[PDB]
Amino acid sequence: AGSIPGRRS
Amino acid sequence: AGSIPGRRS
Amino acid sequence: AMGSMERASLIQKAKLAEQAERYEDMAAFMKGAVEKGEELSCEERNLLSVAYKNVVGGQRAAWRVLSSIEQKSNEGPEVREYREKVETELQGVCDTVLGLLDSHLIKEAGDAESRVFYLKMKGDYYRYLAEVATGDDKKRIIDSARSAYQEAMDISKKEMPPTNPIRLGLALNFSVFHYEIANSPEEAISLAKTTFDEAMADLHTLSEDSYKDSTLIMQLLRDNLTLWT
Amino acid sequence: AMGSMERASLIQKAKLAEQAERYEDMAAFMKGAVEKGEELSCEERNLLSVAYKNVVGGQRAAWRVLSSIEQKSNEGPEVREYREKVETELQGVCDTVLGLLDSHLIKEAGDAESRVFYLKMKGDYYRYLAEVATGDDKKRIIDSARSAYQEAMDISKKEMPPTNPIRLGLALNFSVFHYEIANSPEEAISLAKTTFDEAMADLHTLSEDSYKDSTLIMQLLRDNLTLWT
Ligand SMILES: *Cc1ccc(S(=O)(=O)N2CCN(CC(C)C)CC2)cc1
Ligand SMILES: *Cc1ccc(S(=O)(=O)N2CCN(CC(C)C)CC2)cc1
Ligand SMILES: [Ca+2]
Ligand SMILES: [Ca+2]
Numbered sequence A, B: 001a002g003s004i005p006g007r008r009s
Numbered sequence C, D: 001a002m003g004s005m006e007r008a009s010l011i012q013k014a015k016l017a018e019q020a021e022r023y024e025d026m027a028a029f030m031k032g033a034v035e036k037g038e039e040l041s042c043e044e045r046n047l048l049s050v051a052y053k054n055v056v057g058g059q060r061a062a063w064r065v066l067s068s069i070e071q072k073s074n075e076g077p078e079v080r081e082y083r084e085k086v087e088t089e090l091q092g093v094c095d096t097v098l099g100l101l102d103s104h105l106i107k108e109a110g111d112a113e114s115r116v117f118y119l120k121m122k123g124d125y126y127r128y129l130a131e132v133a134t135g136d137d138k139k140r141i142i143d144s145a146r147s148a149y150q151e152a153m154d155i156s157k158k159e160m161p162p163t164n165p166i167r168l169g170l171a172l173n174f175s176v177f178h179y180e181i182a183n184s185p186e187e188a189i190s191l192a193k194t195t196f197d198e199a200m201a202d203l204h205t206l207s208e209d210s211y212k213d214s215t216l217i218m219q220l221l222r223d224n225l226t227l228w229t
Helices: C007-019 C023-034 C042-073 C078-108 C112-132 C136-159 C165-181 C185-200 C208-228 D007-019 D023-034 D042-073 D078-108 D112-132 D136-159 D165-181 D185-200 D208-228
Strands: none
Touching: C007 C023, C007 C042, C007 D042, C007 D078, C023 C042, C023 C078, C042 C078, C042 C112, C042 D007, C078 C112, C078 D007, C112 C136, C112 C165, C136 C165, C165 C185, C165 C208, C185 C208, D007 D023, D007 D042, D023 D042, D023 D078, D042 D078, D042 D112, D078 D112, D112 D136, D112 D165, D136 D165, D165 D185, D165 D208, D185 D208
């Protein structure tokens, strides 16, 4: 299950 | 130009 | 520690740190910026979230490697000690983020876009605490995640369109909470499906660029639905 | 800081930190192990080198990003200030590694395999200092790299076969020094070619596993020769 990657602006 | 990667044992 | 640096300089250095893939530095610059006491713009909120997501994401990945090794060894004290060290560090980062949200980002956030963003963060960082928690501690931490996500959901459904990317990412992450933390896979599947379908029906209202933003997150909902069904 | 932890526990935790991709931790565990005062085995030397190569490799990559941004801006003070902060951190790591080699890894290293390994490290970390140095400082740092690499080369040519992987990696990195630092591309090309050819002629002596180890590094020499010619 993946959450929002959220690692790049 | 690449040196020895050297990042993995 | 960043008290002597100008707010605008902290923001500029957080953007440089992102480009340099220096996420610990990025998070420290954005903590300094929050501690100036002013509200954050949309772009500044994203810098804060990106910085801490990368820091805690590396900690979580390391904790999972160590936890797996520890579980295999239970089928000296060093694996447990080192897993505990990484775990404590991860908990410290989550507590720092939660403390920024509580002092005082959430209480000053009046617009739906900011308030939902911060409450989604609060749910996420309690969720990361829940991933490493064991026992009754886990129960209260789980409820704190749930309560933050639920308040964000309630605001998002009243104040934002179903394609809004924050609303979509909130629903995605709350569905992961249900599936992975709360042992509620059916609630996870129902939320992801309803969110996807209601967004699909609103895509006709969007520009080409907004369409791209919303469909990207919808694909993540679909990817989870494919894994879960 | 690691003085209260057993040597064997530091070594075990360095291996765990490698698996978790926690290279700062790995380097701190291996610094603690070196500071116990005992010589390092082959495997322990590799753990020390891998840890610091990853730490300084991330610093170097960030310094290059920031230096490029700074150079474009020179075609506020924040880019220079942050490049300087990363640069100082990188220099501190290189100084730490050099200090371990000087107190007291090199002086206790009598076998050719250990002494060449440590002198190659000394050349590498002075080379990383040279990459960020400006002016006359750069001259003396460059000469310190050169002198370390040259002593390692002299020992390696007397004491190791031309296919030995340490001898090959030393020659590879000294050739990069000549090309990138010393402004001696012809010396770089001649060293890489001679090293490759003398290794090729010795491959017949090797087992299948040693053949794989040596040919891997020979391909790196060839890759540089292809880029340089
Ligand atoms: C929780 C959250 C944070 C940020 C956004 S966003 O700024 O709109 N943006 C959406 C696209 N996304 C791309 C990845 C690959 C999912 C990055 C963030 C949305 C929700
Ligand atoms: C400078 C140096 C360090 C270590 C070696 S090695 O232990 O023999 N080893 C050779 C293979 N190499 C693979 C990469 C992809 C080059 C890893 C290290 C050799 C030279
Ligand atoms: Ca000010
Ligand atoms: Ca002891």
